[PDB]
Design a protein around this ligand. Structure first.
Ligand SMILES: O[C@@H]1[C@@H](O)[C@H](O[C@@H]2CO[C@@H](O)[C@H](O)[C@H]2O)OC[C@H]1O
Ligand SMILES: O[C@@H]1[C@@H](O)[C@H](O[C@@H]2CO[C@@H](O)[C@H](O)[C@H]2O)OC[C@H]1O
Ligand SMILES: [Co+2]
Ligand SMILES: [Co+2]
Ligand SMILES: [Co+2]
Ligand SMILES: [Co+2]
Ligand SMILES: [Co+2]
Ligand SMILES: [Co+2]
Ligand SMILES: [Co+2]
Ligand SMILES: [Co+2]
Lengths: 708, 708
């Protein structure tokens, strides 16, 4: 096992009693349809059922035999049509499906029914997953339909093939051999994402390269689009707003100038001639030096709508990112809400505002982005991070399921109780036209796609939740572990719990209690809570925690930046009262004295030390847990994960010592004697921050020759 | 087939008659020894014999059975010792072996015998190779010893894991998980190289990063050395001559300063404490802005000897590169010879001068480096390039076997007939102590290690030629094709001839007739024969061709730069007379009028055009040849090579058109009417040079957003 198949491991069911049962149930595979998508479904079932059931199952269009798996839509399979499923099937829409043990013409059969061909494909993947996870097919009757419209992944890939915040190798897209070489991996990539119901992908960096819109690259991209099409995945591209000028065709990119409007209309026509079902554009504009409307004195609705008007005739959409924040504002936290609230209602119907789960930047824990509960007349979608920019690259084990679950189940009170983030995204709260979530996966050419094996679990969790936002981190992990490693109960429970605690461990050894943004800038690998004196203050560490001799935290109540007033009243009330604010968010909103007593009985200095030390202990416990699993995992992946956990323990100790000693130097309070005193002093950890290798090809820190 | 196994494909022998014969001859594997090296040999024979013979062959130490493969040395295998091989074994030295079908106490055996364990390992790989190439074991009696001491590969890997002139992915060395994670791939890398007899590797960029000498990185590198050691491969490191300054320990790097001498001796001690059999140092100094002794007003002997004094007590050596040339000389061709000739005999016995095959920079054809025939009191070694910096990156098929053979069989007349480069390298011509050959392979994390499947053939040939410098390109291709693809004679012949013509095709469409250095600067992917006006002229294209309305070529005779006088008399004569100079080198030494008549009857302009058009035709012929092999090759690799050849044809045409149109614009002569006239003009090809994607992560050109 080298991880190439990820969770699509079609190995014979290990439980022999169960294997026999499946073997009696699925003896033939009946597929009448022959469209590309149906063919892809048949091909997956054929390879999947043959592997899992350890016998040759070939997809065939023949007279129905007893004990068959029959797939199709009423339109492409007369057998499925004969069941007259009616309303039951129809309610499942354009992507849903029904899996049911039933009878046709007296024959025993298990049907993968749907209204569309992509519905059959999704249904087929679920059929396989049931087997992969050793669920019973007897009396099977289940239907499912996705709860969000655009379920997409994002790749921050540069055209040179280096991935920004990419810890799993070079970009998968081999531009030098495209379009001529349709590599097998492009199809496997499609199969991975289709297996989760992911129906779209942005293959290029948001720090966007204009070349993607030239003929040279559109031919390459079209070949990728072709490979992805039979698997229901639409192609999207990140665009550079200054494209008209980069191509030398117009002396401005002002969205109100007719020549600019025409440039993009003509370019959309060119794109659509290459990729007739192109999904549309992802846009990072007027943020971190990236070009945008405000550079021409226009607003984000004006810029987005101009792009949207160009794509509208072709059915394309603009995913316009809300990750915007000007250096001059008093509180970065407030930024996005204050930028976009005045524009609510001004965006065209095929513009969707793509918002990170939190107001800052993918930190281990952030409160929900206020825009989610505030924008009532604009299409929204979520942006989550899978690649571990802030969770330890490819060396740290960190299942992100819980982060996503936490976010999606957060009650916002936008329109009273029941206004969870998930319900907002689905369109149940504010009535909206387009819904979705995007996941920044940043996989690469490493054999196992994600570098660290467990980053696969995050990918998985993300994909499952995009399909159904109420799926728990626990459910997703159970499924993933069974598909990826083993169906042994003794293995699943400990390793699932290990996965479930990994995120919190990553909070604890880095920045607990509402602390945030304590990373080495700008690589983000290691600790650097002392960071100051950067061109922009809101990229430093001290800006956020505002530690002094008397206290720590950032005042976001009515007496401070009043960011709490950007939230619905019940959240503002709960978070602004020291009696009710969750301790896991406290320092985001309150500047508190070191003597403040926490729920545990410890003072805030004590509780900070306790959490940092807890994070390291949690990693050490993960080590012990993983070591007890050697009998259930293959030798190669076992050794790799064991080794990576050793690296993570070493770094978590470095994180703990660096942060505790730094905050000690400011607070001037001792570390309690029941905690192991750090091996060295604060200057040594500063030196370690300057010299400890940063393991990412992209960030310049990896080339740093600093040795002192 | 995804190329991960390279030429060590242990699939069952297809010829059933042959298979039975091998199955009757090798029924058991007898191994008495148990050292790490013998264990690795035994492991290789076990996996190899089992796969090739399609039956379980397990290494055992037991009472000898009839029809056994018996391996060992007289010291570790009583059975081998009982044969009293004597003088037969003595002639094999420290790395040689004997392969022989014989008898031990009545029992039919085949022995792999040597004086050392590594000799047994090398012999074990040859035994496998015999079987892999379907050679008969009956009456087998052969011996072999390497002809060069230091057979190494070079990795231009940066510590961020980007490879300089790297077309095959990221660096193999995963510094973020080292030393903790001993990846299986590290062992497979060792197996690949040991299979060829390669006993050394320089893992880091010659543009050297001083971090490799820090404890942080030495701990990581030692884990690599540990993995490489049982395979007989020693560890070497490129060094930065300014390291004492970079570490902040001394205020100069002057080699005559006692503090600097002491810094390197103390650092050597540190290195050997981690790696007790460390091979030594590779050094790029006073070249292309890299630091060196001349930066302190010292010479290369003074610099090299100071490093050599530090390594001497530990047995280490210094590979000092002669790739040096300063911008204000009249003729870069003369550079290295004028730099090093005055230092002949001034280098310590553990310094070896590492010299490129030619005096410029790995161009598709270069005459031999004059230093090989001139230095008589200095250890020398060859530097060859495998990675296709100048042969089309990972998209062009360019077997380098013929280049290496051409070089190694070149008569220099240094000391009579038989003064071939190969014979000089062996130490027979000048009587030197330390000999070798280095190969710049630059593989990466791509699944097939080399990107383009055929780059594996060039690595293969290099290693075989490092073992025996008289091995032909034809022989190495025959072996490689059989090991990599098929033993079918109808496949071997045409694909072997295709491989053999590929180098020459790459000369023809780029720079035939002694033209050189016509590449886009400084990425090197595409044509740019117009290149001028760079910070230094010797990095441009016009500097070399000197094309004008009246002629082309560079005068290196007595009436020009007189670089020919740097060669032995007979060579200068032959190359300096228009009657005897090879046409494949003519423009290196002579500036000729466009009306000069060539051997073919064509004038020089006509011949120029003919060659450029010939190169494209040769690529088209390679396409047709490869299409005829579909029945013999697995579908995946077949499709991949088919597609790459399409990219190569497109590029070859771009090269042909760009060059023919450029030289036409200078010469003012028509392209003869029988040739397909390019439809676009020269300005268009200049535009394509600015905008055609450069497929390499490392060079900045791949990030170029130029669109016009
Ligand atoms: O969210 C912000 C990040 O975008 C920022 O990342 C920066 C990207 O550009 C790099 O050149 C910088 O080094 C790096 O800091 O980091 C700060 C964070 O607030
Ligand atoms: O041999 C010379 C090369 O070394 C040179 O390659 C240069 C390497 O440094 C890069 O930064 C430059 O861009 C590149 O030109 O090119 C010319 C060749 O003569
Ligand atoms: Co894995
Ligand atoms: Co980059
Ligand atoms: Co645990
Ligand atoms: Co206290
Ligand atoms: Co290959
Ligand atoms: Co680099
Ligand atoms: Co041919
Ligand atoms: Co003419």
């Amino acid at each position: 096992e080298d991880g190439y198949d990820m969770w699509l491991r079609y190995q014979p069911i290990a439980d022999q009693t169960l294997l026999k049962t499946y073997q009696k149930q699925i003896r033939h595979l009946h597929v009448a349809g022959d469209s590309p998508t149906i063919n892809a479904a048949a091909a997956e079932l054929q390879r999947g059922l043959s592997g899992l059931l350890n016998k040759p199952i070939v997809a065939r269009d023949e007279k129905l035999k007893d004990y068959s798996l029959v797939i199709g839509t009423p339109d492409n399979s007369p057998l499925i049509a004969s069941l007259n499923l009616g309303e039951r099937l129809q309610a499942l829409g354009a992507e849903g499906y029904l899996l049911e043990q039933t009878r046709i013409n007296k024959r025993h059969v298990v049907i993968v029914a749907a209204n569309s061909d992509v519905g059959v494909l999704y249904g087929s993947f679920h059929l396989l997953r049931l087997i992969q996870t050793q669920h019973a097919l007897e009396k099977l009757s289940l239907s499912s339909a996705p709860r969000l419209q655009h379920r997409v992944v994002n790749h921050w890939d540069n055209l040179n093939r280096v991935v920004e915040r990419g810890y799993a190798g070079l970009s998968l897209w081999d531009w030098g051999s495209l379009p001529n070489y349709l590599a097998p991996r492009y199809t496997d990539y499609a199969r991975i994402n289709a297996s989760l119901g992911i129906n779209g992908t942005v293959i290029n960096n948001v720090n966007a390269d204009p070349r993607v819109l030239s003929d040279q690259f559109l031919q390459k991209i079209a070949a990728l689009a072709d490979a992805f099409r039979p698997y229901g995945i639409k192609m999207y591209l990140s665009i550079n707003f200054n494209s008209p000028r980069a191509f030398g065709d117009v002396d401005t990119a002002d969205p109100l100038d007719p020549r600019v409007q025409q440039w993009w209309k003509t370019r959309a026509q060119k794109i659509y001639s290459y990729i007739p079902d192109f999904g549309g554009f992802l846009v990072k504009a007027d943020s971190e030096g990236q070009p945008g409307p405000q550079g021409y004195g226009r607003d984000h609705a004006e810029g987005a709508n101009m792009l949207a008007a160009a794509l509208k005739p072709f059915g394309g959409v603009v995913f316009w990112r809300a990750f915007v924040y000007h250096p001059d504002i008093e509180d970065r936290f407030r930024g996005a809400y204050d930028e976009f609230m005045p524009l609510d209602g001004k965006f065209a119907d095929n513009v969707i505002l793509q918002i990170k789960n939190g107001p800052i930047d993918f930190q281990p824990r952030e409160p929900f982005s206020a825009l989610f509960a505030g924008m009532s007349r604009t299409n929204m979608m979520m942006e989550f991070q899978i690649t571990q920019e802030y969770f330890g690259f490819a060396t740290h084990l960190a299942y992100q399921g819980p982060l996503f679950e936490e976010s999606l189940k957060t009650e916002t009170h936008a329109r009273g109780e029941g206004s969870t983030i998930g319900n907002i995204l689905e369109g149940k709260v504010f009535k909206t036209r387009h819904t979705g979530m995007a996941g920044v996966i940043n996989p690469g050419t490493d054999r196992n796609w994600t570098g660290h094996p467990f980053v696969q679990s995050s990918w998985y969790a993300f994909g499952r939740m995009a399909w159904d936002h109420q799926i728990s981190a626990a459910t997703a992990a159970d499924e993933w572990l069974r598909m990826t490693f083993s169906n042994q109960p003794a293995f699943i429970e400990p390793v699932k719990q290990m996965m479930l605690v990994s995120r919190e461990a990553g909070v604890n050894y880095r920045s607990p209690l509402g602390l945030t943004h304590l990373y080495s800038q700008g690589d983000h690998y290691g600790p650097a809570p002392w960071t100051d004196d950067l061109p922009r203050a809101d990229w430093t560490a001290v800006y956020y925690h505002r530690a002094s001799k008397t206290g720590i935290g950032f005042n976001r109540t009515k007496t401070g930046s009043n960011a709490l007033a950007q939230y619905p009243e019940p959240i503002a009330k709960a978070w602004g009262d020291l009696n009710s604010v969750p301790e896991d968010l406290i320092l985001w909103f309150h500047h508190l004295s070191w003597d403040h007593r926490m729920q545990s009985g410890r003072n805030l200095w004590q509780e900070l030390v306790h959490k940092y030390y807890q994070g390291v202990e949690q990693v050490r416990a993960m080590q012990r847990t993983w070591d007890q699993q050697e009998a259930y995992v293959d030798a190669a992946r076992f050794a790799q994960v064991k080794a990576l956990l050793q690296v993570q323990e070493r770094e978590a100790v470095r994180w703990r010592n660096s942060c505790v000693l730094y905050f000690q130097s400011v607070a001037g309070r001792p570390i309690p004697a029941n905690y192991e005193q750090p091996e060295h002093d604060l200057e040594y950890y500063k030196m370690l921050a300057r010299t400890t290798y940063v393991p990412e090809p992209w960030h310049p820190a990896s080339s740093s020759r600093v040795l002192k």
